[PDB]
């Protein structure tokens, strides 16, 4: 398959890894901080997803330095991964239009 499709698949796998790792690390970073809510794994996984998609409801978020650092990694991974899917779609469309034009 073409590069853009391979890259998209890879990006998806990497994002899943980051969501899982981010959830584990977020709990690790936040427990020990009075008042923190990102402290159990199931909801931390949910938090990682709404952060990677940049939805950010505000129901859960990190209060510590390391939790916030983990958060930035999750954000960047989500933004870049979805952006890469967009880039792959554009490449697919560009190629199809070239053909349709007989170029």
């Amino acid at each position: 398959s073409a590069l853009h499709w391979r890259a998209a698949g890879a990006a998806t796998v990497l994002l899943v890894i980051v969501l899982l790792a981010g959830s584990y690390l977020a709990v690790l970073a936040e427990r020990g901080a009075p008042g923190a809510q990102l402290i159990t794994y199931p909801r931390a996984l949910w938090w990682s997803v709404e952060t990677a998609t940049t939805v950010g409801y505000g129901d859960l978020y990190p209060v510590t330095l390391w939790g916030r650092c983990v958060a930035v990694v999750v954000m960047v991974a989500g933004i870049t991964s979805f952006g890469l899917v967009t880039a792959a779609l554009a490449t697919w469309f560009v190629g199809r239009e070239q053909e349709r034009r007989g170029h």
């Epitope: 584990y24 709990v27 690790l28 020990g32 901080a33 923190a36 809510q37 402290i39 159990t40 794994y41």
Partner: antibody, heavy 118, light 106 residues
Framework: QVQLQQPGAELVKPGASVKLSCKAS????????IHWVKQRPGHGLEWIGE????????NYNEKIQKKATLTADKSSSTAFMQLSSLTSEDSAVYYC???????????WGAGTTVTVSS | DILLTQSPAILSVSPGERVSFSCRAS??????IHWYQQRTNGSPRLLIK???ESISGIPSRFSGSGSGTDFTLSINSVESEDIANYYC?????????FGSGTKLEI
């Protein structure tokens, strides 16, 4: 079978210290946290602290004087709590409990009755 | 730190009657409350998780309800084996905390 095994009792001279143990069996996951809870005779349950074996990180109750130090041995699947410079105020039953990272203590040890006396 | 208030501290009920234990949290904690039973000379035993979820091995007699700041542990038709101390515990915010406990008397 018993998931958490703790010694029945420990006698400690005032000022001295002791190391309590909690041997765990059954399913074990990287998300497991081992907690320690203190209970004075006739009184309620007081959270002491927690440790995550898969990483070695430990957190403690900030409201009370820190008497404990938590450690864990992955190979022997054993968690330890070092209580130091104890006084009669430290005499109590100390329970270890297992939490699967989801907030509740699914299982508890039988508890170790610690007595601080000469 | 979240304060869990269990009042009254002692509940007196007649055999077979329905009883309800109260646990009030100092702030809203959704349904992140769990209940434990501790009989004389025994270790705590998990009865209900996340305010209303059943635990395998626990008599259907036990149920839980509530969300926010007010929670209830109910026993339908109490019997002798139910005599013990009951504690609530929250896991919504760090650190986890316990209520002061309620004793069931028959």
């Amino acid at each position: 079978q018993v998931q958490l095994q703790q010694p029945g009792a420990e006698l400690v001279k005032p000022g001295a210290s002791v190391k309590l143990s909690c041997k765990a069996s059954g399913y074990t996951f990287t998300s497991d946290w081992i907690h320690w809870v203190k209970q004075r005779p006739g009184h309620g349950l007081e959270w002491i602290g927690e440790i995550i074996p898969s990483y070695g990180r430990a957190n403690y109750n900030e409201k009370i004087q820190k008497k404990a130090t938590l450690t864990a041995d992955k190979s022997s699947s054993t968690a330890f709590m070092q209580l130091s410079s104890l006084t009669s105020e430290d005499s109590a039953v100390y329970y270890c409990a297992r939490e699967r990272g989801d907030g509740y203590f699914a299982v508890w040890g039988a508890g170790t009755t610690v007595t601080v006396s000469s | 730190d979240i304060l869990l208030t269990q009042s009254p501290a002692i509940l007196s009920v007649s055999p077979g009657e329905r009883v309800s234990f109260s646990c009030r949290a100092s702030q809203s904690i959704g349904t992140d409350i769990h209940w434990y039973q501790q009989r004389t000379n025994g270790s705590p035993r998990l009865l209900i998780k996340y305010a209303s979820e059943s635990i395998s091995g626990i008599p259907s007699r036990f149920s839980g309800s509530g969300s926010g700041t007010d929670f209830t542990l109910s026993i339908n038709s109490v019997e002798s084996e139910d005599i013990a101390n009951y504690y609530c515990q929250q896991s919504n915010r760090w650190p986890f905390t316990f209520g002061s406990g309620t004793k069931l008397e028959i």
